[PDB]
Amino acid sequence: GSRFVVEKNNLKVTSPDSIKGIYECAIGNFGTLVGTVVYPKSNQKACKSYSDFDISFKSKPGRLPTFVLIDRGDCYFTLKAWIAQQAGAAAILVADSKAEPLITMDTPDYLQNITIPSALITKTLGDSIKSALSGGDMVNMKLDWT
Numbered sequence: 001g002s003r004f005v006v007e008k009n010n011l012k013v014t015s016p017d018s019i020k021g022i023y024e025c026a027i028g029n030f031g032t033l034v035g036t037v038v039y040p041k042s043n044q045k046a047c048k049s050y051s052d053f054d055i056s057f058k059s060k061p062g063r064l065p066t067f068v069l070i071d072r073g074d075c076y077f078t079l080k081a082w083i084a085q086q087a088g089a090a091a092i093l094v095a096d097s098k099a100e101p102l103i104t105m106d107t108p109d110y111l112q113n114i115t116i117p118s119a120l121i122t123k124t125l126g127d128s129i130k131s132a133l134s135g136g137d138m139v140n141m142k143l144d145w146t
């Protein structure tokens with residue numbers, strides 16, 4: 001089957017209240033955690049090393065782990081997950097570039113070494129998160145890989 005499996009009650013936005021709720025996502029097969037979402041200002045498709053930009057997603061001690069929001073395009077989803085993992089992300093969310101069913105997004109080497117949770121999300125949810133972040137809101141999220 002597909003390497004990303006659609007799940008109905010596995011992603012919960014916990015803050016801000018404007019977008020709080022439960023949303024569908026497609027969880028990667030390779031691969032509960034609460035994290036804070038960041039949308040990088042560069043290399044937004046995660047097809048090149050974040051270290052070339054001097055960008056790190058490792059959280060400070062005592063702070064929420066960082067979930068990186070990544071745009072679909074230009075490279076395979078597994079490479080995006082590997083690259084965010086090397087940058088210290090605790091998980092990755094890849095937002096679709098088109099408005100369409102999630103199951104359509106996952107179309108037909110280091111894959112055995114990906115260890116962070118990975119999920120695909122819709123364009124609508126990606127845009128909502130980006131809007132919340134752009135306004136100054138912290139976006140917190142709970143992933144459940146059950």
Ligand SMILES: [Cl-]
Nearest residue numbers: 003029030111
């Ligand atoms: Cl695989």
